[PDB]
Design a protein around this nucleic acid. Structure first.
Ligand SMILES: [K+]
Ligand SMILES: [K+]
Ligand SMILES: [Mg+2]
Ligand SMILES: [Mg+2]
Ligand SMILES: [Mg+2]
Ligand SMILES: [Mg+2]
Ligand code: NA
Lengths: 66, 100, 243, 151
RNA sequence: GAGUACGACCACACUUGAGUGAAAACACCAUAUCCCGUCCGAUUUGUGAAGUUAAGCACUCACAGGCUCAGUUAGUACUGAGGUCAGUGAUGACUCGGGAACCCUGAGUGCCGUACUCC
RNA sequence: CUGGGGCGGCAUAUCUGUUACACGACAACGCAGGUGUCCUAAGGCGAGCUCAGUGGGAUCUCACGUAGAACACAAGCGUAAAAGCUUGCUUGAUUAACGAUUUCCAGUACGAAUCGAGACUGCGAAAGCAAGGCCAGCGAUCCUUUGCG
RNA sequence: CUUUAAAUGUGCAAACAAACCGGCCUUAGCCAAC
């Protein structure tokens, strides 16, 4: 009343194929990594965002003036 | 001159075995084993000698003797082995015992 | 020792066969944090032969260790020592000279002068664990670490020179295990050679009643009371002209 | 018969003949950065931070570095899809990988060719295929035949 | 051409025997009041230079045994694919491919770094 | 559960070697054995030593000795200036902001394990090592009970 | 049981969200410092 087999399983698995892995640049979360480096990275990202806002404002002013 | 066979250590053990070891070295140990030599009349059996060079003969005596420079084996740093020629032989030990 | 014995036999490393290296200690000595990506890390090698003292600053590498500075006890004649070359005072001088040479090479000299004099006291070393000083760790090799050894004399010399070697004063001569304190006066006595002077004086008091020890010292006019000034002059010359 | 962590590893986790011993100093001095390609090979003599027996021959990329540990991303097929498993091991159980060596050599060679073309030096003559034909002048000629002594 | 200190690879470097070793080193070696440790200054620790190359160490030598690299073994053993092949069967041959090992015989017996020093 | 059922036994949770076919996976009332405990040291660290055995000599002494011993218990793997033996100090067998992960796997939990951040500490001259004894030794809702705030 | 060791296997890589070559900005992150 208890039987085990692996007969049809490979065919079933390959019907809709073995899907490949997600590219490494996606779902690239950093949670659980080394905290001392994580904190410094966060500070640098904040500075970068401020810089991007300033750059856009400068672009807008230049286009308007000339 | 470094091949001069000299006495290194003399150990005396008393085995009571009921409900003791001691080693002596230096100019004191030479003063000892004079009582043993006198008691044995400067005469012991040939089979008492051992192939290494040591020998011995209540308190049981045992004297181990060899050339100098055997530190290269008991040294901690850069320990090595002493040459076989520099090791003392049974016949040489017997000759030394007869001479002294 | 049959043929099978030789067929299955793994030889040890070469420098373990010759009995020069303790690899278990060397691994933990060169090991560093992996989150540092190979920042420079130096160790202080102190080796004492029968008639010489060698002290060098070493950095490990895959191709082989690289040496940054090196001091020897036989360069002390150029500064004014010609008698001991092995005792505690010689060790202190060697350490101080090595530290001065290394700081002069790095150019960080004139910023970390350590202590201008010697007192035998213990002052904590400043480490990251105001600009920080050069830092190295101490490798004593296979030597036994007992209180009052010469390796710790070299260490004290380097620390007084100005390097930052972490340490505790549990192995300096004037240290009592029960009292858990240090005797800076005893340490200064041993640095400047009071023990050598006293032994020489006793030997000169003897060896005259009966007519090898201190043969050259006695042949020269080395009076047992011309030692502390000699060592102070040696220190001043070393600090003045390390090169 | 039992689903233990280290079941059936008697030959897998075992030192090679006359190669026993703890890791060397070059292993300790090797440098690993995030984004490197590494091989996961277990060392039986460490026993701290070993990976599971599944990951003993796989190659992955580094996503995390700690004081004495590495984080590696490794693919694993489970039924109809492939997972991205994240394993934490000590630094003794990983080894730098030469799987991109040929690609990097190709890139360097192309850059060298571009530099030579810009400079003006003469390029080496291109290689010749071995599938072409030509006149063959033989030094020795023999007869191929079964002889009586062969059986 | 050498020596010492720190080393990477970890026997072509190991194990067993002889011969040689300029200078400088490295060792044996002398000693025990002070720091230090023991039944024992033997090991270890301190303080020194009277004797040497005896020993360690280095080089050369030796069918040495081991180790390393080739050749024979051998297109053999085994093996992926094929047949309404053979044989009662064990098994075997053929067609398109891959391809060893023990043994046996030749050659060899460390190499590469940083610093200081003596020829 | 069951080569009908009953009697017997358990593989009914769980570990090693094998079955098993050189990645991983792989069954039988298949084979040979284990587990529900034990340890304030049999845990942590530093130092000093070298084991099993063999030969010669009067428990002691010398020479050899690649691990043939020992690691609480079954087996496998690993280990020689140690991971074994002796010894000195100790309580990292604590706490650890709901950090991440592996094995089983439905990619759920439980048990076990790996890489970490913070506190307060232990050993060590130092670099360092230690949040038990590597890997088997264990348990939901409701209810009772203790601590905290 | 064992070094030696196949054939069939099995992981990864092979230029457009990648990588390469010289300015600059930010961070304490490391280092005695840069
Ligand atoms: K079924
Ligand atoms: K000694
Ligand atoms: Mg398998
Ligand atoms: Mg130890
Ligand atoms: Mg457990
Ligand atoms: Mg256990
Ligand atoms: Na969580």
């Amino acid at each position: 009343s208890k039987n085990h087999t692996n007969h049809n399983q490979s065919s079933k698995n390959h019907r809709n194929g073995i899907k490949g892995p997600v590219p490494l640049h996606l779902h690239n979360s950093k949670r659980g990594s080394w905290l001392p480096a994580l904190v410094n990275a966060r500070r640098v990202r904040k500075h970068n965002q401020k810089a991007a806002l300033k750059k856009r404002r400068e672009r807008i002013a230049a286009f308007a003036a000339k | 001159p470094m091949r001069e066979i000299v006495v290194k250590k003399l150990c005396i053990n008393i085995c009571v075995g009921e409900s003791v070891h001691c080693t002596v070295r230096g100019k004191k140990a030479e003063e000892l084993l004079e009582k043993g030599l006198k008691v044995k009349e400067f005469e012991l059996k040939s089979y008492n000698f051992a192939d290494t060079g040591s020998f011995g003969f209540g308190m049981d005596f045992y004297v181990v003797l060899g050339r100098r420079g055997e530190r290269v084996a008991h040294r901690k740093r850069k320990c090595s082995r002493v040459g076989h020629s520099h090791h003392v032989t049974k016949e040489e030990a017997m000759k030394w015992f007869e001479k002294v | 020792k049959n043929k099978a014995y030789f067929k299955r036999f793994q030889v040890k490393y070469r420098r373990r066969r010759e009995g020069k290296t303790d690899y278990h200690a060397r691994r933990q000595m060169v090991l560093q944090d992996k989150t540092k990506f190979g920042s420079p890390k130096y160790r202080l090698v102190v080796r004492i032969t029968n008639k010489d003292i060698i002290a060098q600053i070493v950095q490990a590498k895959i191709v082989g260790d690289e040496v940054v500075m090196a001091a020897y006890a036989h360069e002390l004649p150029a500064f004014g020592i010609e008698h001991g070359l092995t005792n505690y005072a010689a060790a202190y001088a060697t350490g101080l000279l090595l530290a001065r040479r290394t700081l002069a090479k790095l150019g960080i000299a004139d910023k970390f002068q350590g202590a201008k004099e010697a007192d035998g006291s213990y002052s904590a070393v400043r480490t990251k664990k105001e600009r920080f000083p050069f830092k190295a760790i101490l490798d004593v090799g296979l030597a036994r670490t007992t209180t009052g050894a010469r390796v710790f004399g070299v260490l004290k010399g380097a620390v007084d020179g100005g390097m930052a070697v972490p340490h505790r004063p549990n192995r300096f001569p004037g240290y009592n295990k029960e009292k858990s304190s240090l005797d800076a006066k005893v340490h200064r006595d041993r640095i400047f050679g009071k023990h050598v002077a006293d032994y020489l004086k006793q030997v000169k008091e003897e060896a005259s009643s009966n007519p090898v020890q201190f043969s050259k010292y006695m042949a020269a006019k080395v009076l047992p009371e011309s030692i502390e000034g000699m060592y102070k002059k040696a220190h001043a010359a070393i600090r003045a002209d390390p090169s | 018969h039992s689903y233990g962590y280290k079941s059936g590893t008697r030959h897998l986790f075992a030192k090679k003949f006359r190669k026993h011993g703890v890791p060397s100093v070059s292993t300790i001095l090797t440098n690993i950065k995030v984004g490197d390609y590494v091989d996961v090979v277990a060392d039986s003599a460490v026993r701290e931070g070993m990976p599971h027996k599944y990951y003993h021959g796989r190659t992955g990329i580094v996503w995390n570095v700690t004081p004495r540990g590495v984080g590696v991303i490794i693919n694993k097929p489970v039924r109809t899809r492939t997972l991205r498993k994240r394993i934490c091991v000590r630094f003794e159980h990983v080894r730098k990988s030469r799987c991109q060596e040929a690609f990097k050599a190709k890139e360097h060679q192309f850059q060298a060719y571009l530099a030579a073309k810009k400079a003006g030096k003469a390029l080496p003559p291109l290689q010749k295929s071995s599938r072409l034909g030509g006149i063959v002048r033989p030094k020795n000629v023999e007869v191929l035949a079964r002889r009586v002594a062969d059986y």
